[PDB]
Amino acid sequence: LMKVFVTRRIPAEGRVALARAADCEVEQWDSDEPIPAKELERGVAGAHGLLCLLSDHVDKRILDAAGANLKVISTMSVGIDHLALDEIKKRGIRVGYTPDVLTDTTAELAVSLLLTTCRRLPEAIEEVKNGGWTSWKPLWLCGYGLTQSTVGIIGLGRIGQAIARRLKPFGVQRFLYTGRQPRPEEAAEFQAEFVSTPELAAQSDFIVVACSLTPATEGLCNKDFFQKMKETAVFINISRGDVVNQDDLYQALASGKIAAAGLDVTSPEPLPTNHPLLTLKNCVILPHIGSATHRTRNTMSLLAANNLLAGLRGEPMPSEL
Amino acid sequence: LMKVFVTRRIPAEGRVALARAADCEVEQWDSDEPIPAKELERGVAGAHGLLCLLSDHVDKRILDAAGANLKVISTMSVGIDHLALDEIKKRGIRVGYTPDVLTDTTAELAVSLLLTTCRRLPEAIEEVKNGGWTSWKPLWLCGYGLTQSTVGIIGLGRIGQAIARRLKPFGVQRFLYTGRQPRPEEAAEFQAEFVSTPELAAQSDFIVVACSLTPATEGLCNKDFFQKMKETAVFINISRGDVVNQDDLYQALASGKIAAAGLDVTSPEPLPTNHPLLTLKNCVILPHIGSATHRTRNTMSLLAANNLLAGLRGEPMPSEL
Numbered sequence: 001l002m003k004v005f006v007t008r009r010i011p012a013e014g015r016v017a018l019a020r021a022a023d024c025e026v027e028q029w030d031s032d033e034p035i036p037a038k039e040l041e042r043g044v045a046g047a048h049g050l051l052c053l054l055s056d057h058v059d060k061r062i063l064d065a066a067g068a069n070l071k072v073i074s075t076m077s078v079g080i081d082h083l084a085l086d087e088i089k090k091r092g093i094r095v096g097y098t099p100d101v102l103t104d105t106t107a108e109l110a111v112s113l114l115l116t117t118c119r120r121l122p123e124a125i126e127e128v129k130n131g132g133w134t135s136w137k138p139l140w141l142c143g144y145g146l147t148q149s150t151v152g153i154i155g156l157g158r159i160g161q162a163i164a165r166r167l168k169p170f171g172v173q174r175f176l177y178t179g180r181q182p183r184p185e186e187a188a189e190f191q192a193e194f195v196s197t198p199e200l201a202a203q204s205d206f207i208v209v210a211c212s213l214t215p216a217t218e219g220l221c222n223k224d225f226f227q228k229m230k231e232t233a234v235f236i237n238i239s240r241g242d243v244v245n246q247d248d249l250y251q252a253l254a255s256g257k258i259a260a261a262g263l264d265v266t267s268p269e270p271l272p273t274n275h276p277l278l279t280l281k282n283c284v285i286l287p288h289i290g291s292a293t294h295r296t297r298n299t300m301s302l303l304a305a306n307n308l309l310a311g312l313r314g315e316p317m318p319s320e321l
Numbered sequence: 322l323m324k325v326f327v328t329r330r331i332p333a334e335g336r337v338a339l340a341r342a343a344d345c346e347v348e349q350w351d352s353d354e355p356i357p358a359k360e361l362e363r364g365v366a367g368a369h370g371l372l373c374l375l376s377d378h379v380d381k382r383i384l385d386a387a388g389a390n391l392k393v394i395s396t397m398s399v400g401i402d403h404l405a406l407d408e409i410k411k412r413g414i415r416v417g418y419t420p421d422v423l424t425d426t427t428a429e430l431a432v433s434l435l436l437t438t439c440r441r442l443p444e445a446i447e448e449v450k451n452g453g454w455t456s457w458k459p460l461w462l463c464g465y466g467l468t469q470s471t472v473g474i475i476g477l478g479r480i481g482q483a484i485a486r487r488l489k490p491f492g493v494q495r496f497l498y499t500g501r502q503p504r505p506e507e508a509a510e511f512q513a514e515f516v517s518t519p520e521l522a523a524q525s526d527f528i529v530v531a532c533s534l535t536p537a538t539e540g541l542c543n544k545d546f547f548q549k550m551k552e553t554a555v556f557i558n559i560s561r562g563d564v565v566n567q568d569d570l571y572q573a574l575a576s577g578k579i580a581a582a583g584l585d586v587t588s589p590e591p592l593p594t595n596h597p598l599l600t601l602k603n604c605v606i607l608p609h610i611g612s613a614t615h616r617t618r619n620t621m622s623l624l625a626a627n628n629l630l631a632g633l634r635g636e637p638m639p640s641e642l
Contacts (some may be wrong), residue, residue: 297460
C-alpha cells in the first residue's frame with residue numbers, strides 16, 4: 001500500500017474517503033489538537049503522501065523526515081505560504097490547495113467581522129449581560145456604517161472580489177483595491193480603482209486585507225500605514241497575521257490612529273490570552289474561522305482527500321498547485 | 322413662548338435647532354437614562370410640544386397630564402407603537418417621527434446580527450478570551466452560510482426591502498416574504514415569492530423578522546412557528562419583542578428545533594440578567610441598536626426637532642404621521 005499520514009481529525013467526508021482508498025496506507029492523528037512538530041516528524045515516516053493543514057509547516061525539516069517516498073502533499077487550505085514550495089518542487093513533489101470552495105464562506109466571514117466590528121456588536125452583547133443596559137439610548141453604542149463609505153481592499157483575489165460583491169449593496173460609493181499588480185478585469189464589476197498603499201490608508205473608511213503572505217506583504221500594515229488612516233476608519237484582516245505589525249496596530253488602537261480593528265488571524269496563533277490586543281474594547285479577534293461552515297469544511301476536506309488520492313496515484317489532481 | 326418638553330438628552334444638531342427657535346422656551350430632561358413615569362407626567366404639564374423616544378410610553382396618561390395645550394408629539398424614531406394614537410387623534414394632536422432616514426443602518430444592523438449568529442462570532446470571540454483556541458481547526462466553530470439559502474422575511478417594508486438587498490450578493494438562492502398584503506412591485510428587484518407564514522418557516526434557512534408589530538402578531542413567533550422551521554435554520558428579530566415568546570424560542574435553542582437566534586429587540590426592555598433567554602450561548606441579544614450610527618442618530622435628531630417646530634408653528638411637516 002502507498003503510505004499516507006493525516007495531521008489531524010478531518011471532516012468525515014474525507015476520513016471515510018482515504019479509508020476506502022484500499023491502494024493506500026493511511027495513518028491518522030486522532031485529535032483536534034495540533035500535532036507537535038516532534039510527533040509530526042515521527043509521523044511522515046515511510047509516507048508517500050501527506051495530508052496536512054494550514055497550521056502544519058511543510059518545511060525542509062519535514063521533507064527530510066518524509067524521505068524519497070514523499071511524492072504528494074495535500075492541504076485542506078487554499079494558502080501556500082506555510083509550504084516549502086522550493087524544497088517541495090525541488091524534490092518534484094506535487095502540492096495542492098483548496099481554492100474556490102472557501103471563497104464564498106471566507107468573504108462571508110470577512111463581511112461578518114467588518115460589520116460585527118464597526119457596529120460594535122461585541123460591546124453591545126456584553127452590556128446586555130453586565131447590566132449596563134437600561135433603555136433605548138440615542139447616543140449609545142453608535143458606530144460608523146457603510147453608507148457613502150469608501151472601502152479599501154488590500155489584495156483583491158477570489159475572496160477579495162467576493163467581499164467587494166457583498167459590500168457593494170451596503171451603500172459603498174467607491175471601492176479601492178491596493179495590490180502588487182492591477183486586475184482591471186476583476187475591478188470592472190465594482191468600478192474599483194487600483195491604488196497605491198499611501199492613498200489607500202488615507203482614502204478608506206474601511207480597509208480589508210485579503211492577500212497572500214509573501215516577503216513583500218510581511219509588516220506591510222504598520223504604524224505609517226495606520227497613521228495615514230482616518231481615525232474613524234475600521235481595519236479588517238482575514239489573510240495572515242504577518243502582513244500586519246501587531247505592536248504598531250495595538251498602539252494605534254490605544255492612541256486613536258484608527259477607530260477599530262477586526263482580525264481573523266494573528267501572530268502567533270493562538271494569540272495569547274494575556275496579549276495586549278485582547279485588552280482593547282475596540283479590537284475584535286476571531287480564532288481564524290474564515291471558512292467555518294459545514295458545507296465548506298466538508299467540501300474542502302473531500303477536495304484534499306481527492307487531491308491526495310489523485311496525486312498519489314500519479315494521475316492529475318482535482319485542484320493541483 | 323410655547324412650552325416644549327424633551328424627554329432625554331439628544332444629538333447636538335437637534336438640541337441647538339430647538340435652542341435656535343426664538344419662539345421656543347425648550348425644556349429638557351438632563352440625562353441619558355429613561356425618565357420615570359412620574360417626572361414625565363410631572364414634565365409634560367402645559368407643554369405645547371413633546372419630543373419623545375421609544376422608551377417613553379406616551380399613552381392616555383401623559384395626554385391627561387399634558388393637557389389641552391399639547392398640539393404635537395414628535396419622536397426620534399420611525400416606529401410609533403409607543404404612542405396612544407387614538408386618544409391622540411380624538412384630541413386632534415399632530416404626530417411626529419423620522420421614517421426612512423434610518424432604513425439602511427437598521428437593515429445594516431439586521432444583516433450584522435444575522436451574520437454574527439450564523440457564523441457564531443460571539444462564541445468564537447469567547448474561545449479566544451477563555452483559552453479554548455489552540456490552533457486552526459477544520460471541525461471547530463463552523464456554522465451555516467447564505468450560499469443558495471432561502472431567506473424568509475416577515476415584513477417586506479422599506480426596511481425589509483433594504484435587508485433583502487444586502488442579502489442577495491451573499492448567494493441567497495431565493496427570497497420569500499409574508500404580510501397582511503402582497504408586494505410584487507416592492508419585491509420586484511429582488512426576485513421574491515409572496516408565500517405564507519406556514520410555508521415561510523418551512524423554506525427559509527434564515528428567518529429575519531422585519532416590520533412593525535400588529536394587534537395580531539403579538540406572540541406570533543411561538544412554539545408552532547419554530548417547529549415549522551428547519552433545525553439548521555436561523556431566527557433573527559429586529560422589530561419588537563412581542564412577537565417573540567422568550568420561552569417557546571427557548572425550547573428550539575435549548576433542544577434544537579432551530580440552530581440559533583439573534584435579537585436586537587426584546588420584550589420587555591431591558592432584558593434581566595439571570596433571565597432564561599440570556600443563558601444560552603446560541604442566543605445573540607443586542608440592546609436595541611438598529612439605528613446606531615452617528616450619522617443616522619444625528620439625522621433622526623435633526624428631523625425630530627424640525628417636525629417639532631413645524632408642529633407648533635402651524636406649517637407643513639417634513640415627516641408628520
